[PDB]
Write a protein that binds this DNA or RNA. Structure first.
Ligand SMILES: [Zn+2]
Length: 55
RNA sequence: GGCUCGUUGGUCUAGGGGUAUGAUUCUCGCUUAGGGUGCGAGAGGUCCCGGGUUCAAAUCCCGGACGAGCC
């Protein structure tokens, strides 16, 4: 006789840790009026070695 | 042994140099008995990360060990 590995355990679903979105919201923090590319939660503010307002 | 680690708005595509191209997707109209199929419009990308190079280069060239940090 011969036998080999197979099958998988039971699984579930309902979401992807994302919820509803729109082109006016942010993917990183879920706020509105901006996108992740400009998110205020990122280390690219409020101060750094490039103020971008005096240079 | 303990603690922290929310960037889903494309993906795939060749890369003998231009942010893009090609294949597919989502929404709506028209088409159809019908969410289908085709066509048009709208939703679409500084295409591994950092550094170097002539206007412009994933594999142009170069580095990249078991995920990382703290106690
Ligand atoms: Zn944000």
């Amino acid at each position: 006789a011969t036998v080999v590995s197979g099958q998988k355990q039971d699984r579930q679903g309902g979401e992807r840790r994302r919820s509803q979105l729109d082109r006016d919201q942010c993917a990183y923090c879920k706020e509105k009026g901006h996108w992740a590319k400009d998110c205020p939660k990122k280390p690219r503010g409020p101060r750094g070695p490039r103020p971008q307002t005096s240079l």
